């Protein structure tokens, strides 16, 4: 159901987040909450964005 009147803000509600990168798809009902920095090339991230 719709949540506008309950989750929208004029200044912008920025609390809701979604995962975007991963080497493989999640299996059914499998939960990933990892926050490790995603490395796109050969350069290591070392936890720095």
């Amino acid at each position: 159901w719709n949540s506008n009147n309950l989750d929208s803000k004029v200044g912008g509600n920025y609390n809701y987040l979604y995962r975007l990168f991963r080497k493989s798809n999640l299996k059914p009902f499998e939960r990933d909450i990892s926050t490790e920095i995603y490395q796109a090339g050969s350069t290591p991230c070392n936890g720095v964005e």
Partner: antibody
């Protein structure tokens, strides 16, 4: 700096087939979103397809049953394959990495493809 | 799909001035738009995203704005290389698409 070497392109007759490809100088194609866009003079530009980092596929309705995308990890090379073109498809196709909500960040120089008997 | 509209069909400004570009769409985008630059015989380059998020490699002269299917880009102190066609890119649905394009010309 960041470079993508392209390959393929050329003439094909209708009813034929062709495999196109492009490679990465430094970037990990296996670990980022990849997409094709085809650009034609006088007709405009369009979005084609994409592979998500999980390997999932997704197309535009205009090439279903006629286009297919994939990715070879053995050579870090993106690939592209063609079935039964149309004269309208006459265009220059490009390889480019996008991230997340589809900023088309880095681009190759593009390679033309021509169809005719 | 959702269609975008670009105005003007042609824009020509002299150097050192400030050029303005506006884009319109049938259905809203909620400030997810983006601008790309492509010189002839060159690959397109990313410029700015959403309302005002400029790209890394672009100078401060570039600035866009907008919301609710009406969106505007303004560039100050025009420089000779800035001649190109420009493109706005859609975010509202799958499939994506992007508009016809705009060509900007310099008068010296």
């Amino acid at each position: 700096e960041v470079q993508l070497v392209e390959s393929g392109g050329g003439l094909v007759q209708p009813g034929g087939s062709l495999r196109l490809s492009c490679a990465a100088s430094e970037i990990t194609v296996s670990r980022n979103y990849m997409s094709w866009v085809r650009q034609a003079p006088g007709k405009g530009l369009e979005w084609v397809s994409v592979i998500y980092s999980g390997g999932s596929t997704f197309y535009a309705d205009s090439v279903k049953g006629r286009f297919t995308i994939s990715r070879d990890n053995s050579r870090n090379t993106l690939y592209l394959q063609m079935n039964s073109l149309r004269a309208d498809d006459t265009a220059v196709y490009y390889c480019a990495r996008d991230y997340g909500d589809f900023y088309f960040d880095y681009w190759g120089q593009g390679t033309l493809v021509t169809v005719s008997s | 799909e959702i269609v975008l509209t670009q105005s003007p069909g042609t824009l020509s400004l002299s150097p050192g001035e400030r050029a303005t570009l506006s884009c319109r769409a049938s259905q809203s985008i909620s400030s997810y738009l983006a601008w790309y630059q492509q010189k002839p015989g060159q690959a397109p380059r990313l410029l700015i995203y959403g309302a005002s998020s400029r790209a890394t490699g672009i100078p401060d002269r570039f600035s866009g704005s907008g919301s609710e299917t009406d969106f505007t880009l303004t560039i100050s102190r025009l420089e000779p290389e800035d001649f190109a066609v420009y493109f706005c890119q859609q975010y509202g649905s799958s499939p994506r698409t992007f508009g016809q394009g705009t060509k900007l010309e310099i008068k010296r």
